[PDB]
Symmetry: C3
Subunit: 332 residues, 3 copies
């Protein structure tokens, strides 16, 4: 009887940050209530000033990470205000039945809907918009995110001992296919609707024009770099709703990786680089051991350094010469 369960309202935060939650569950099953507002907006995605009409959950690319526990109920109020132009919906890969909720969540501009589902399987899972006949266009315009369903006793290593993270970040990787004129310049449109047939032709090439973390080239750099301290345990959740990726932390490793993101399986250990298939979210746990700048990249290095799939960590603390040292500095 769901009416006797506690309800809790969560306010979502912008990626790469994640709303507050408990790793080990301090209550029994709950109905966890979320609200999301669809926003169609103009987004500038690179240094050149290239602009797309992005389709977003809650104003961001990716949409926010939702965090619940196994056997919680998720109740999502989804709002499509009348300032938008398109029909949208939501498919949760975490959910069972009705096209992951897609069949029950079709909202025209001006409409809302509330969907509930039980989170029966632990792991990180993609969610994405998927309207009949326009599925890839919505997804590759930025309309995807992820949900983490933690086991009620938190994460476990390959032996079954607890793993506790001190910080968690969410990296949404987005493949864009900006249409081009005959000469290779990116085209501009006044509405999302105008671009439809050119977007289809751009997608059919299977060649993205940009691949970005958190919605833009350089989004996770400078003042927006991810931060940590030597000795901190960091969980990085990474999703790609449409195309394969191969994350790598330059200067580090994935100590424990769930590459396909499902926590009933034991993690892979000591990974240099791991494959997250398109349509999947994965999770990597790392304990930082050296201070400095680290780059976190898709290790197709063309995709990383030319197309934009690179961000930075800035890590504070003490340098350990036993792990690494320059014996003779560069010289004649």
């Amino acid at each position: 009887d769901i009416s006797t369960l506690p309800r809790v309202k969560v306010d979502l935060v912008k990626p790469p940050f994640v709303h507050a939650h408990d790793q080990v569950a301090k209550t029994g099953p709950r109905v966890v209530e979320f609200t999301m507002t669809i926003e169609e907006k103009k987004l500038v995605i690179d240094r050149e000033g290239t602009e797309i009409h992005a389709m977003t959950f809650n104003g961001s690319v990716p949409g926010p990470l939702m965090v619940v526990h196994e056997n919680d109920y998720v109740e999502l109020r989804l709002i499509n205000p009348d300032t938008n132009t398109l029909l949208h919906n939501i498919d949760f890969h975490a959910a069972t039945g009705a096209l992951g909720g897609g069949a029950l969540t079709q909202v025209n501009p001006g409409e809302e809907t509330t969907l509930r589902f039980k989170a029966t399987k632990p792991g990180v899972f993609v969610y994405h918009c998927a309207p009949e006949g326009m599925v890839p266009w919505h997804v590759t315009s930025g309309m995807n995110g992820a949900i983490m369903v933690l086991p009620r006793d938190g994460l476990k290593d390959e032996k079954g001992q607890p793993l506790t993270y001190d910080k968690i970040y969410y990296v949404g990787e987005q493949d864009f296919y900006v249409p081009k004129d005959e000469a290779g310049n990116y085209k501009k449109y006044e509405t999302p609707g105008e671009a439809y047939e050119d977007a289809v032709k751009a997608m059919r090439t299977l060649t993205p024009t940009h691949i970005v973390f958190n919605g833009a080239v350089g989004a996770l750099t400078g003042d927006h770099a991810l931060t940590a301290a030597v000795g901190e345990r960091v969980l990085v959740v990474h999703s790609q709703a449409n195309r394969d990726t191969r994350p790598h932390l330059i200067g580090g490793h994935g100590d424990y990786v769930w590459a396909t993101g499902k926590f009933r399986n034991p993690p892979d250990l000591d990974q240099e680089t791991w494959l997250i298939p398109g349509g999947t979210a994965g999770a990597a746990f790392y304990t930082f051991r050296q201070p400095g700048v680290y780059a976190y990249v898709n290790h197709n290095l063309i995709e990383a350094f030319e197309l934009g799939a690179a961000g930075h960590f800035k890590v504070t603390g003490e340098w350990n010469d036993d792990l690494m040292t320059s014996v003779v500095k560069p010289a004649s």
Copy 2:
């Protein structure tokens, strides 16, 4: 002494269906006899009426699934009738030596051959044609299939308890590279031989024009949708002889997945999406929990919804509101 073993003749069925077999072996080792006839035929692969000269085992794309048990002998009579034009052969990834049988099975039009091999390793494995110097052309013209070698005591979960499927389906995914004129229209040829150099140029782009299940856009939809009932245990075998794929059941999961298809390994649990590398067959076990339409897609959604890698399941039975429900239907 193979002469003292029982022989059994199996008649193959068209995909996505699979010939009858026992999961747990009810006899000792056998010589299981199969026959396949190579057919070159004109195939229409999309709604636009685009036609290719397909090269098939037994008239279908994919070729039929063969099912044996570990330590059976497979004996394959392969017939290339004189109405064909090309030399063909067969490489079984399940087999050991002679290029998977490829070196011993070269048949000109008018010839047959009989190959025997011992199925020493359990799993689902690709088979494909592979004639010297024309390997990708044959494979990407549809000349591939799969064989399942069951452990003699059937399938096991990650703990080692039996897993029993009520139904089994075989999904062959095929990347095609239809050559195009200067303007982007698909070219037409009277024979397979005519297309050779244009096919090579189309392949070298690494960009397929179509990606289909069971030989055509929409082949596993409408009246040809896969069927099941709530509470049935379904095994889906999926192969791709040439290009990576990432299957996903929309509205469901892969409860137990052997992504690289080899049953001595424990399955991966609770998968949303899994990667089957090109040149591999994989297997996913699911128990249906909700009725309705499910889409089974390659979750590069461009490949799925624009290039054709999508099919449907229609599932009958009772709807479970505890797993999912619409709390407030779409409205103002």
Copy 3:
């Protein structure tokens, strides 16, 4: 105190061969000293005589495999002689901190540097050049290799029993992006520097013009085929610094595979084909059971047979008819 540890000087050998080493460690931790000299050179990569300006460690593509044990220190003297033109460095994915050593190893032509790091994690790992702002150009010009960090007690199977290899080979797979004129002919340059902007444009296509083992189309064939004897245990280390690959031994299997190359994890068994993600090294163990020619391919067969990702093994010994036999040779 590193000053009390034994030092040992190793001389590197050209791939596909590997310097001598012990599987099970016969000493305690050591500082293992290597030297590498960067060479920029003109390389012919195909039968047509297409030439690139390759950037190499020690004159080869890939660079040589370095082999140490877990908790050894690696000390690398890296020399950029003044006959080169570019700035280079080295990132070891095996190492912790400073961008895998990249931040500390920047050497102009005329300079050297010596870097030390502790090999804390067992597995096969990529190393590659990664100079600020020119990372993919260096990597895709051939400037990558691998290091194997063996557990001190050698390799173990999934149950934990020893696995001992009789031979080891290293296959570096290289994606090249040779720039093309308007008509599709490959362009030629007098220096590496001249090509820079055309190379960037070629890379941005995400479509390699060639994919090769050991630096050229046909490099591991004929007189340069890999050799083995029936009953030998062979370890094949395989790396790809930039793009996903899916190795397959035609006529054989991967009996034990570490697809993502990290030995604290149990191997995958009985693989037909496995995915090594770009930015990763993997390892496959096989025991040969039949004599003859075997092809070792990337099983995107276009990439293999049209773009060049294929080599051969020649295996000597006795033919086993129980595993495979031609019952009726090709005939009318």
